[PDB]
Design an enzyme around this catalytic site. Structure first.
Site, PDB file in Angstrom:
ATOM      1  CD1 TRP A 130      -1.996  10.095   8.560  1.00 45.52           C
ATOM      2  CD2 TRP A 130      -3.673   9.397   7.268  1.00 45.52           C
ATOM      3  NE1 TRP A 130      -1.797  10.607   7.301  1.00 45.52           N
ATOM      4  CE2 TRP A 130      -2.819  10.185   6.488  1.00 45.52           C
ATOM      5  CE3 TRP A 130      -4.804   8.837   6.676  1.00 45.52           C
ATOM      6  CZ2 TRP A 130      -3.069  10.442   5.142  1.00 45.52           C
ATOM      7  CZ3 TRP A 130      -5.047   9.082   5.348  1.00 45.52           C
ATOM      8  CH2 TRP A 130      -4.187   9.878   4.592  1.00 45.52           C
ATOM      9  CG  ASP A 211      -4.752   3.583   5.555  1.00 43.93           C
ATOM     10  OD1 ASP A 211      -3.883   3.404   4.707  1.00 43.93           O
ATOM     11  OD2 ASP A 211      -4.954   4.713   6.107  1.00 43.93           O
ATOM     12  CE  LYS A 246       3.208   7.345   3.347  1.00 51.43           C
ATOM     13  NZ  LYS A 246       1.737   7.011   3.427  1.00 51.43           N
TER      14      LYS A 246
END
Lengths: 396, 396
Positions: A130, A211, A246
């Site tokens: 990312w 993460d 999410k």
């Protein structure tokens, strides 16, 4: 004072969006999105969320500041979700959790904390990873290095190159891992590979930083935590930056958490205090709405049931689209094998398309994707599958 | 890695809170609070807010990420409130606003932005000043200096000492001003004083940074903005960090803004881009709930009327308490003159009590205040006024 300031470079995603929008074409498809989308092409508010929001509206009597670390119940629910209930980490009070503004905010808080309270100077991130990981850590004045991970040739996890590159990392260096649904390869390590990394990590004196932004999107809530749990069972110290953006579809409410793990209660408490100091100097205290919603749902049997089902529906939607995408490709007379798409988890995957093919798809077909060839499967629907695949086939 | 981490120093306020709580005494009074409280001693949710929240519940169809700078309407309403509608700054598109997690968050964003995009190295704050100002700026690696402001002897604004101390400030340095309701002296400059500072500021090449957290608490919405407006009319560049935590009673939802002002549109746009970059590297994008509520109210005539009235009620409650406090003191056989209390704006003021007197008040009377003698007038009620004053008299 601002006369000589140079403009910041432009994100391609946001730049892609604007381009998509200003497109008059009809059959346009946007696979450059970064959020989940349902069969109808929207990002709705979960039912469980709406229910929780009604409850808050009726029961909230004040908007008084939350503690620096936020809602207590939110912290405990988050820990159980991460480590599972009955976990020794919990019973031994070795973990402290701070409610933060999204997963990104958690990362930033960890970075500031590490930079001022430890000797950490470097953080290792996978290649690729990312893109925001670099900016966050660099902003704290930390050095960012890359470890091998993805095998663009075989579209798989090159464990060897991985282990090999990480050998250049010194003790006291932090190593960042994606809990599940690697962004954006969709390639995760196996349980056995996780256990191998855990052992190696301990042996090398690395500080693992997880993460975890997609818990529940790969196999399930518990399943997706196996890797992390594999590390926790072996480390004294650990850091977890989780996000509910999410899995709860709470993107804009900025709901996340930063979990600190130490060898013991005394140590974690003493260490947490400096983490709080880091927060106080940033945004002071966290936004209640989003986290209140998460806590209400996770602590209510009924609401939790509903939410778990909604999450399952999302996961299955994605699994369905991956499968359908591969089948339709093959049917449409696809050149190459795309079966690897089925072995990848989450919303993202590298299509293997070239920069020139991506450009072509857009200019000629109104199909939008990132120049890297990255696609968001949630951007696909049974309805747009055919046209999508026909266009791709046309560029191969 | 966390073995040698030293505990962060404990902060008085939070420490005071815990002490207050663990107090069995009945007549206990807490003046060490940092928020508004009503006649019943509570920090309720505003009626206008509740209405706005119902509206969002019924109309929200997605929780998709907001832009880096947040809700557009929020930005425009904010600018009007700051600069007044019809302002040239607005019509000339010289200002850009970013929605941030509270006023504190706005401060931090400004700091990071200045630290990486300008030559700023020092920031001047008044003595005394909100203690969190130091932490925020230092955290960005900025040096913090103090200018004279308060006159502990006459309980007033020592304009001379102020002007004098600020002469040590060089061009390119940033000077921080409280828009109104100076925290925590309650002492603000007169319009003419503001104008004098504005002229001097331009002459010396200072970059003014306004911390505006109490708009509407001193005299009124427009009145309270006179100082800021005085500066805006004379500067090419300016920065404003505003908060809605208090005037909207939205403390825990983290609602604030960071406004950037440049000589022209092109410049502000180019500069804002780097500000966005700073945000992306921090929390990514802001929390919607709180800001949505604000934008809904400010843009609806009906809701806005209700809110303005609620704000007025708050301001008047405070003015009432300040007056009542002084009168009760005098009646109760007060030694010294406390009339200065009446000339101070906002929730805070320095009582002039000594550290030992404060300690005594708490030990002996259950009256809680900060060691600095700072008191929150909103913690006073017509009901607790007598006992409070009798205790104070007993320690003079």
């Amino acid at each position: 004072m601002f006369e000589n300031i140079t403009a910041a470079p432009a994100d391609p995603i946001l730049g892609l969006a604007d381009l998509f929008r200003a497109d008059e074409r009809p059959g346009k498809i946007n696979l450059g999105i970064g959020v989940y989308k349902d069969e109808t092409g929207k990002t709705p508010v979960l039912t469980s969320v709406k229910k929780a929001e009604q409850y808050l509206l009726e029961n909230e009597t004040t908007k008084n500041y939350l503690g620096i670390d936020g809602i207590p119940e939110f912290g405990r629910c988050t820990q159980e979700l991460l480590f599972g209930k009955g976990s020794a980490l919990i019973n031994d009070k070795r973990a402290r959790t701070a409610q933060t503004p999204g997963g990104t905010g958690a990362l930033r808080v960890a970075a500031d904390f590490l930079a001022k309270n430890t000797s950490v100077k470097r953080v290792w991130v996978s290649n690729p990873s990312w893109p925001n990981h670099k900016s966050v850590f660099n902003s704290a004045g930390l050095e960012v290095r890359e470890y091998a991970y993805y095998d663009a040739e075989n579209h798989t996890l090159d464990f060897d190159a991985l282990i090999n590159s990480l050998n250049e990392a010194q003790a006291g260096d932090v190593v960042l891992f994606h809990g599940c649904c690697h962004n954006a390869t969709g390639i995760d390590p196996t349980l056995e590979q996780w256990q191998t990394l855990a052992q190696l990590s301990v042996e090398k004196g690395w500080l693992p930083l997880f993460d975890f932004a997609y818990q529940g999107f790969a196999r399930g809530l518990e399943e997706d935590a196996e890797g992390l749990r594999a590390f926790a069972a072996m480390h004294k110290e650990l850091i977890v930056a989780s996000s509910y953006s999410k899995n709860f579809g709470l993107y804009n409410e900025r709901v996340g958490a930063c979990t600190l793990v130490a060898a013991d209660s005394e140590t974690v408490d003493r260490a947490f205090s400096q983490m709080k100091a880091a927060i106080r100097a940033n945004y002071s205290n966290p936004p209640a709405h989003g986290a209140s919603v998460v806590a209400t749902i996770l602590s209510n049997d009924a609401l939790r049931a509903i939410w778990e089902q909604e999450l399952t529906d999302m996961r299955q939607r994605i699994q369905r689209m991956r499968q359908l995408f591969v089948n339709t490709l093959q049917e449409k007379g696809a050149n190459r094998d795309f079966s690897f798409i089925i072995k990848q988890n989450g919303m993202f995957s590298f299509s293997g398309l070239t920069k020139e093919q991506v450009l072509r798809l857009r200019e000629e077909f109104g199909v939008y994707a990132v120049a890297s060839g990255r696609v968001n499967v949630a951007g696909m629907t049974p309805d747009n599958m055919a046209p999508l695949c026909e266009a791709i086939v046309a560029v191969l």
